[PDB]
From a paper:
To further substantiate that L-Cterm domain 1 has no influence on the conformation of L-Cterm domain 2, we crystallized and solved the structure of the isolated domain 2. This structure was refined to a resolution of 1.8 Å. Co-crystallization of the domain with m7GpppG, m7GTP, GTP or ATP did not result in additional electron density. Again, we did not detect binding to m7GTP-agarose of the isolated CASV L-Cterm domain 2 nor a thermal stabilization of the protein by m7GTP. As neither a monomeric form of CASV L-Cterm (deltaC) nor a dimeric form with a different dimer interface (domain 2) binds m7GTP, we conclude that the dimerization of the protein and the presence of domain 1 are not responsible for the lack of cap-binding activity.
The two genome segments code for four viral proteins, the nucleoprotein (NP), the glycoprotein-precursor, the small matrix protein Z and the large > 200 kDa L protein which harbors the viral RNA-dependent RNA polymerase. The L protein synthesizes two distinct RNA species: (i) the antigenomic and genomic RNA as products of genome replication and (ii) the shorter capped viral mRNAs during transcription. To initiate viral transcription, the L protein presumably uses a process called cap-snatching. It is assumed that the L protein cleaves host cell mRNAs downstream of the 5'-cap structure and uses this short capped RNA as a primer for viral mRNA synthesis. Here we present the crystal structures of the two terminal domains of the CASV L protein: the cap-snatching endonuclease in the N-terminus and the 326 C-terminal residues, which, by analogy to LASV, might play a role in transcription.
Author numbering: 1800 to 1892
The structure:
């Protein structure tokens, strides 16, 4: 495949109540990655997204593409599907 993947923690073994997954464009430097942090709340899972990227990129489209890969890789895609671009923290290196 064409993406790099990592995770730290899981829903069954969260790290201080959180777990995170990161998916990135292979060989990106400065790195293009989307990190999704999840935690249990009453009735479901709450997701927060950070797009680490670079000045000039089409952040919306990068976000949408990495979001689709997160949907296939996460354990609670319904919670990630709710994230809209306006909610994403964008860090341009």
């Amino acid at each position: 495949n064409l993406f790099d993947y990592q995770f730290t923690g899981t829903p069954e073994e969260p790290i201080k109540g959180y777990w995170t997954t990161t998916i990135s464009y292979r060989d990106s430097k400065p790195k293009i990655s989307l990190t999704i942090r999840q935690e249990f709340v009453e009735g479901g899972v709450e997701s927060q997204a950070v797009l680490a990227t670079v000045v000039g990129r089409p952040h919306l489209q990068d976000f949408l593409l990495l979001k689709r890969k997160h949907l296939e890789y996460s354990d609670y895609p319904e919670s990630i599907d709710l994230i809209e671009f306006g909610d994403v923290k964008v860090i341009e290196k």
